[PDB]
Amino acid sequence: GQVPVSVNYHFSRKCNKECLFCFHTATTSHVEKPENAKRGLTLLKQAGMKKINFAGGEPFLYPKFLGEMIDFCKETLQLESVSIVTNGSLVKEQFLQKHGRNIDILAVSCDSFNEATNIKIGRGSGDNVQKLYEIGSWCQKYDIKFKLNTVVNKFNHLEDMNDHLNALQPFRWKCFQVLIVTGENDSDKTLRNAHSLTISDDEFDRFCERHSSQTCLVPEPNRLMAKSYLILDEYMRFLDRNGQQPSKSILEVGVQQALQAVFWDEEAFVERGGIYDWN
Numbered sequence: 001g002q003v004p005v006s007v008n009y010h011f012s013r014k015c016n017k018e019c020l021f022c023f024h025t026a027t028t029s030h031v032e033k034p035e036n037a038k039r040g041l042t043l044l045k046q047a048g049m050k051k052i053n054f055a056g057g058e059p060f061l062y063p064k065f066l067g068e069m070i071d072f073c074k075e076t077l078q079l080e081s082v083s084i085v086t087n088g089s090l091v092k093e094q095f096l097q098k099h100g101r102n103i104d105i106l107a108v109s110c111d112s113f114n115e116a117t118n119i120k121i122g123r124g125s126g127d128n129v130q131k132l133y134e135i136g137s138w139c140q141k142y143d144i145k146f147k148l149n150t151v152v153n154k155f156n157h158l159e160d161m162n163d164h165l166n167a168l169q170p171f172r173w174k175c176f177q178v179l180i181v182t183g184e185n186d187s188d189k190t191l192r193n194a195h196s197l198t199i200s201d202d203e204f205d206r207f208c209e210r211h212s213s214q215t216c217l218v219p220e221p222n223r224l225m226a227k228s229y230l231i232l233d234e235y236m237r238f239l240d241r242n243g244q245q246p247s248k249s250i251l252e253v254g255v256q257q258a259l260q261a262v263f264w265d266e267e268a269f270v271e272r273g274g275i276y277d278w279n
């Protein structure tokens with residue numbers, strides 16, 4: 001069986017924002033009890049997990065749970081890399097002061113540095129860029145690696161972000177071609193429809209070209225993003241991200257049997273840079 005070296009745990013689906021492309025929508029409000037999440041994280045560690053990314057959903061809607069899991073994953077499990085990805089709006093300095101020793105990487109999602117763009121996308125009410133710079137400075141202060149995630153879409157594919165990126169200096173800048181996920185953002189029956197925001201291969205490439213002097217840039221065209229992640233849902237089942245049913249929960253059948261039920265393109269994972277110096 002595959003070794004689940006780097007795992008995204010979408011532990012909640014609730015979110016405070018309305019990004020028009022969102023591919024992990026608010027279809028439930030279930031979250032595992034802390035004791036059960038810690039058991040699941042323990043099984044993943046024992047199966048060879050090195051890196052955990054907390055996602056959703058917006059993680060900072062659940063700071064008590066998130067802090068508990070981050071402290072556990074570093075202090076108890078001794079994971080090599082504990083990461084979070086957040087829209088940044090609800091992050092407070094106090095959280096990084098309290099839990100910063102246990103956070104390896106903090107990724108903030110900001111798709112543009114024109115505040116009109118972030119508002120039209122539906123992520124922001126006009127303070128995302130300001131908040132991003134603030135979080136950048138806190139990571140500096142609390143010894144956290146600072147990472148930026150950008151979705152390249154119809155509304156921002158012509159933008160030039162170089163001066164900002166030169167000011168921010170994240171160690172890692174993920175540039176995702178907006179991705180369609182069956183059952184999440186692919187019709188008018190779903191909570192989103194991203195079809196009107198999708199871009200050509202050539203548009204995505206010209207964006208990456210515009211930013212070719214950024215050595216932190218990590219591009220992810222649809223080909224490399226689609227099946228290259230290990231994704232646990234709010235019940236700690238692995239998701240196939242293609243319309244297939246989830247696995248059974250790792251808490252019910254164990255990691256090996258759960259992972260067997262999904263496809264994970266390990267060739268894609270390596271090629272996109274999934275293994276890196278993540279502490």
Ligand SMILES: Nc1ccn([C@@H]2O[C@H](COP(=O)(O)OP(=O)(O)OP(=O)(O)O)[C@@H](O)[C@H]2O)c(=O)n1
Nearest residue numbers: 008053055083085107174225226229231241274
């Ligand atoms: N088909 C896919 C592919 C990816 N994702 C999600 O998209 C996000 C991408 O965020 P990123 O910061 O790239 O995740 P990490 O795993 O932290 O990336 P890396 O280790 O490469 O820095 C993750 O939450 C992942 O689970 C998804 O929901 N569906």
Ligand SMILES: C[S@@+](CC[C@H](N)C(=O)[O-])C[C@H]1O[C@@H](n2cnc3c(N)ncnc32)[C@H](O)[C@@H]1O
Nearest residue numbers: 021022023056057058085086087109149178179
């Ligand atoms: C679902 S969000 C969860 C964490 C948090 N709410 C945030 O937005 O950072 C995880 C990452 O996927 C990105 N993402 C969301 N929808 C996407 C899509 N359709 N295609 C590509 N990336 C997308 C987000 O911008 C973010 O960087």
Ligand code: SF4
Nearest residue numbers: 015017019022057087
């Ligand atoms: S991508 Fe936007 S809508 Fe989706 S979970 Fe993150 S902030 Fe919320």
